[PDB]
UniProtKB/Swiss-Prot annotation:
Functional summary from the UniProt entry: Histone demethylase that specifically demethylates 'Lys-9' of histone H3, thereby playing a central role in histone code. Does not demethylate histone H3 'Lys-4', H3 'Lys-27', H3 'Lys-36' nor H4 'Lys-20'. Demethylates both di- and trimethylated H3 'Lys-9' residue, while it has no activity on monomethylated residues. Demethylation of Lys residue generates formaldehyde and succinate.
Annotated keywords: ADP-ribosylation, Chromatin regulator, Dioxygenase, Iron, Metal-binding, Nucleus, Oxidoreductase, Transcription, Transcription regulation, Ubl conjugation, Zinc
Residues of the full protein shown: 11 to 341 of 523
Protein name: Lysine-specific demethylase 4D
Keyword hit for Metal-binding: yes
Species classification: Eukaryota, Metazoa, Chordata, Craniata, Vertebrata
Cofactor: Fe(2+)
MF terms in GO: chromatin DNA binding; damaged DNA binding; histone demethylase activity; histone H3K9 demethylase activity; histone H3K9me2/H3K9me3 demethylase activity; metal ion binding
Entry GO CC: blood microparticle; chromatin; nucleoplasm; nucleus; pericentric heterochromatin; site of double-strand break
Domain JmjN: 8-50
Modification after translation: Ubiquitinated via 'Lys-63'-linked ubiquitin chains. Deubiquitinated by USP14 with the help of TRIM14 leading to stabilization.
Residues bearing PTM PolyADP-ribosyl glutamic acid: E16, E17
Annotated binding of Fe cation, by residue: H182, E184, H270
Organism for this UniProt entry: Homo sapiens
């Protein structure tokens, strides 16, 4: 078995290897990358996502989210308070302000220590989940707006034609902005490209051990667990690496820098934080190996998780027994 310790692997494809996305994902899996839940892909030196980032300031963040924390430093939830719209240029200035800017630090490890010590005492503002793309249309390799769609994958594997679309999302981050512990909708893959700015630190649990994280989370968030049998689908709970180590939960961590891709694999729980002003682009995707994970994915039916139009078909076809209850949660 390849990668039996479930380490995060880093890949350096050549320009030739970067042509066929599906093939390269399958190669990474052949080397055991999926066992970690997360992989880094450094693009060939010839490649670029677009020519410059000099003209992005007029993109609108229609609903910036202030991430307010409750709990203790290592075990907390966050809720998202909606703020007034602002442009990317206004958000960048905000991120760089004395109130929100990254503090002085020695290295990534010192910054990680400061994040876990101090996150809860601040409420950073995140521009998340903005439909759109920063890939130049002429970028033909690993262009996250030109991937094969999950609807087409389901149709190719299973023969059923379904409605729905699959488009990318932009994320504009600042120091301390936080992504809570989650797997993807329907335990899909994700791919994330850090277009510009400061790094993003990731934490991940191997898919084969995801239920260990879920059992810890039910212990640590006992009211939330009683409210919903899949509350991590709400994407609000944080647990620090120190707490994970104290409870024996297997995980790994890595820092993504600008110009790098990360892939999350089916049922790989992940969480993380931004180091400073940045912009990432991410999308879900599927492969043949996902289908079995999609069929087994947990679902939130309490009403909190509320998701895209396109998840309807996935539930309906892959999980027909769960469909009625899940749809009630959506309505
Ligand atoms: O970058 C973020 O805030 C969150 N991204 C992801 O969870 C991802 O790409 O799957
Ligand atoms: Mg612009
Ligand atoms: Ni994710
Ligand atoms: Zn729920």
């Amino acid at each position: 078995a390849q990668n039996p310790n479930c380490n995060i692997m880093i890949f350096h494809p050549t320009k030739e290897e970067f042509n066929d996305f599906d093939k390269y994902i399958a190669y990474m899996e052949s080397q055991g990358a999926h066992r970690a839940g997360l992989a880094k892909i450094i693009p060939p030196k010839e490649w670029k996502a677009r020519e410059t980032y000099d003209n992005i300031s007029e993109i609108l963040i229609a609903t910036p989210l202030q991430q307010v924390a409750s709990g203790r430093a290592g075990v907390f939830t966050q809720y998202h308070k909606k703020k007034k719209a602002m442009t990317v240029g206004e958000y960048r200035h905000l991120a760089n302000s004395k109130k929100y800017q990254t503090p002085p630090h020695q290295n990534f490890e010192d910054l990680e220590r400061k994040y876990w010590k101090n996150r809860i005492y601040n409420s950073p503002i995140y521009g998340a989940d903005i439909s759109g793309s920063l890939f130049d249309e002429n970028t033909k390799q690993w262009n996250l707006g030109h991937l094969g769609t999950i609807q087409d994958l389901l149709e190719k594997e299973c023969g059923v034609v379904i409605e729905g679309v699959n488009t990318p999302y932009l994320y504009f981050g600042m120091w301390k902005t936080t992504f809570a512990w989650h797997t993807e909708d329907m335990d899909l893959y994700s791919i994330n490209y850090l277009h510009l700015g400061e790094p993003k630190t990731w934490y991940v649990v191997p898919p084969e051990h995801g239920q260990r994280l879920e059992r810890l989370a039910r212990e640590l968030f006992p009211g939330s667990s009683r409210g919903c049998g899949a509350f991590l689908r709400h994407k609000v709970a944080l647990i620090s690496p120190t707490v994970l180590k104290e409870n024996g939960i297997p995980f790994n961590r890595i820092t993504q820098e600008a110009g790098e891709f990360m892939v999350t694999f089916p049922y790989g729980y992940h969480a993380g934080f931004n180091h400073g002003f940045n912009c990432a682009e991410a999308i879900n995707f599927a492969t043949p190996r996902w289908i079995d994970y999609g069929k087994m994915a947990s679902q939130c039916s309490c009403g909190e998780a509320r998701v895209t139009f396109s998840m309807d078909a996935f539930v309906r076809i892959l999980q027909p027994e769960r469909y009625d209850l899940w749809k009630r949660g959506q309505d």
